[PDB]
């Protein structure tokens, strides 16, 4: 598979070459094998900047749908109720009104 | 049919017989370069007996035998051919008077 | 038909066709930048650049359009003064 | 054990030690440059000597320093000092000419000069749309603001300046970007034979750098679009009872804005063009109030209240918000109509300009 | 003579023209030509302005 | 100061370092200068003055 | 049209140079991986009937791309398309070479 | 008067420096082409002592 390694519980797993001691292990600590972290898979490279506008920008979530509607029709109305709260009260303390 | 669209054409025309003209005279110094090396003039063959190269033509050679007597325009043995397909001539005034006068002057070597 | 001559550039060979050294732009490298441009610009909004509808130019020609109006409107307005 | 992801986050999710500490005191130090932009301001216009303008003016200094000092280290509060810098910016060379608008150039200019100071020396991002949004919106209120303060202005050709150059950056919005981006410009060659040479490996290899700072800045650009795009929609209309092409522009700019949502693509971008109605409704409501009508701002909020119904029929209804289920007619004769629009604003900006009335 | 002779002998003029001074013979852009027209085009907006504000005298 | 930053920048006085619309543009005002330099003499010697 | 084929080509190309890739991984394995394998049923795996047999690893770097790319032009030098042919000859030397 | 002076100079000054190609080229008296009508000329070749 891919050569595992001991890991202190959030951090680096462990370099081979080092020992128990030489990197600080304590009676009763706890230990989890976790992959080594070797290193990252060959970048992409293209040169058809329109090309390379299309393909590098992917890594945006940018998809539209309906989900980034609710979110906005959620802030919309909390700034509906904001705003309307903020001109009716303004309303009321800079004249003498009842509506 | 514009008359800038055949000035644009008669531009690339004369841009293309620059370039065969740059290449037939790359040609040229070529043949006289070989010619100046097989035939030098008669003031620097007393060096050629001392050196390593006094008797070298054999009779294997295009240059054997060949006794040199002077410069005058050697005729270009390259061919400088034309496709000539068009036929019933009635071609471009300019583009063609720039193709005779390539294919009249040049085929000759100078001195 | 007319059997016209298409645009030719052979091999140099030669010690002079290194020797140009001017900047000189022609019709063609404008319009190629201009695709160049309005395939980049419509590679990082419309995020697809197959180029078949460009909308980016759909609207910079209106507004276009709207100024040449303008211009139309100033110039019959100024004719009836 | 079955869960294994909880013991992962529970080294995560560490103690107080000194990770929120940094936190808190750049929180602090924001909080201490907003309050000593706005206590000063107030002291500045209310009743003040110089010590108003000396006190927005040495704060302004020191953020500038702070900003371009800690860069090398943080890189994070760096860019939210450099956030936070351009509103003692603002006031200080707003405040510092005297008089009064003849110093509100000088504040275009001076968060202007800022941005573009700030922005060159940037890595990919945080260089974001609060940088290139408000260069763009600077240089747009400097330049109506180069024709308010030299010249004699009707008050009427502000807005329609601020409204053109929205319209202009809007529009020609990603080739600006593009050009912004400094992209491996293209090789096209000559007819004859002056062959280029190749793009290296390294200015090829930096391009998903490019590309992220070209969506940076074309979100900017549309940003900055919208915000002069409702400065001057809220300045052509809400001074008292203006005419019905007034209305029109309003109308018109704001429309436009909701109908250019459906060409681009990236979704902060197609959020801020959906926004500019909702803004416009803000900004004229708070026009209409500190201008004192109190009669058609119960009217704004109504047509806000409009367009969050029209937000949440369009949320909770997914067939109105689906461009799939509508007709090839409905979206051709769309496209024709959000064409004419702004086809149709520069004619109107012409007749309510004057410029069919001086000839 | 035909048109396409003149046309031939415009066009040779022009490239000397290019050649001497551009110093080059591609003819691919010929700038020299762009200010020969553009002064021309001026003298044309002038004499077109002066009809134009002599038929105006006959209004 | 022109010819100065021209001569020890050696960048902004090559051409091939710009960009293939900005001098297209460079000569569209070179055109548009000498295109509009007989009009501006003909309303200085007034020659619109007489007719 | 022609950067859409050229776009299109592209996506071929770059499908080629990833199988190529996923062979050479599979083939030869970053020098850590290699002490998981005599355990499991991979270890005296390479037959001299296999394409890779007494081929050693010695590093990471540009495989040439075994496929073709070779474009048939036949023309006898017609000046091509200004903007076309530099996106060729951008894909003929950039996509030829594999990288590490 | 003035200004027509200083016109007439500077339209000189353009008109001489815009044509100032065709203008050398006719000064140095440049061997001038013989193009040859489209109907039966022959198009001649030029001595070997003017090239």
């Not at chain 1, 595992?4 to 009763?28: E, K, M, N, R, W």
């Not at chain 4, 959020?271 to 009508?293: C, E, K, M, P, T």
């Amino acid at each position: 598979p891919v050569r595992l390694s001991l890991a202190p519980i959030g951090g680096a797993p462990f370099s081979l070459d080092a020992t128990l001691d030489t990197v600080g292990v304590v009676d009763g600590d706890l230990l989890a094998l976790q992959a080594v972290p070797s290193g990252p898979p060959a970048p992409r490279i293209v040169e058809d900047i329109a090309d390379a506008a299309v393909i590098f920008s992917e890594a945006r979530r940018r998809q539209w749908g309906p989900t980034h509607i609710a979110r906005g029709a959620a802030l919309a109305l909390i700034g509906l109720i904001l705003v309307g709260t903020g001109l009716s009260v303004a309303h009321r303390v800079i004249t003498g009104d009842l509506l | 049919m514009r008359t800038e669209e055949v000035d644009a054409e008669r531009a690339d025309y004369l841009r293309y017989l620059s370039v065969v003209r740059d290449n037939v005279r790359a040609h040229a110094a070529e043949q006289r370069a070989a010619l100046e090396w097989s035939h030098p003039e008669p003031e620097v063959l007393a060096t050629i007996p001392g050196t390593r190269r006094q008797w070298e033509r054999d009779p294997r050679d295009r240059d054997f035998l060949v006794l040199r007597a002077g410069r005058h325009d050697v005729p270009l043995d390259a061919a400088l051919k034309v496709k000539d397909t068009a036929d019933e001539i009635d071609l471009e005034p300019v583009a063609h008077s720039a193709l005779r006068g390539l294919l009249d002057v040049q085929r000759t070597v100078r001195d | 038909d007319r059997r016209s001559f298409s645009s030719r550039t052979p091999v140099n060979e030669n010690p002079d066709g290194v020797q140009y050294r001017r900047g000189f732009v022609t019709r063609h490298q404008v319009s190629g930048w201009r695709f160049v441009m309005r395939r980049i610009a419509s590679g990082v909004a419309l995020h697809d650049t197959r180029m078949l509808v460009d909308p980016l130019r759909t609207q910079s020609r209106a507004v276009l359009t709207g100024a040449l109006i303008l211009v139309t409107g100033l110039v019959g307005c100024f004719i009836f003064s | 054990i079955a869960d294994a992801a909880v013991i992962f986050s529970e080294a995560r999710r560490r103690q107080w030690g000194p990770t929120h500490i940094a936190r808190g005191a750049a929180l602090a130090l924001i909080g201490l440059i907003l309050v000593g932009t706005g206590l000063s301001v107030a002291h500045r216009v209310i009743t003040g000597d110089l010590l108003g303008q000396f006190i927005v003016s040495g704060i302004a200094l020191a953020t500038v320093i702070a900003a371009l000092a800690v860069r090398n280290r943080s890189a994070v509060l760096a860019t939210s000092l450099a956030v936070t810098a351009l509103v003692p910016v603002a006031a200080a060379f707003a405040l510092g000419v005297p008089g009064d608008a003849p110093n509100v150039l000088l504040a275009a200019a001076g968060v202007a000069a800022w941005s573009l100071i700030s922005m060159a020396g940037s890595p990919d991002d945080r260089g974001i749309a609060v940088f290139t949004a408000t260069a763009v919106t600077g240089v747009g209120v400097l330049l109506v603001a180069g024709a308010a303060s030299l010249w004699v202005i009707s008050s009427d050709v502000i807005g329609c300046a601020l409204v053109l150059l929205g319209l202009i950056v809007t529009v020609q919005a990603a080739q600006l970007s593009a050009m912004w981006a400094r992209f491996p410009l293209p090789v096209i060659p000559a007819p004859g034979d002056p062959t280029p040479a190749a793009r290296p490996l390294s200015v090829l290899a930096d391009l998903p750098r490019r590309v992220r700072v070209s969506q940076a800045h074309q979100t900017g650009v549309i940003a900055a679009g919208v915000l002069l795009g409702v400065a001057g929609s809220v300045a052509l209309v809400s001074s008292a009872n203006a005419s019905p092409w007034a209305w029109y522009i309003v109308v018109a700019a704001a429309a436009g804005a909701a109908l250019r949502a459906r060409v681009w693509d990236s979704a902060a971008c197609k959020a801020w063009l959906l926004g500019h109605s909702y803004l416009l409704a803000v900004a004229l409501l708070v026009a209409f109030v500190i201008g004192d009508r109190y009669q058609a701002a119960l009217w704004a909020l109504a047509a806000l209240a409009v367009l969050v119904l029209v937000w949440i029929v369009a949320a909770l209804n997914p067939k109105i918000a689906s461009p799939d289920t509508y007709s090839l007619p409905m979206r051709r004769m769309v496209g024709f109509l959000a064409t004419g629009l702004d086809a149709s604003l520069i004619p109107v900006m012409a007749l309510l300009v004057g410029l069919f009335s001086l000839v």
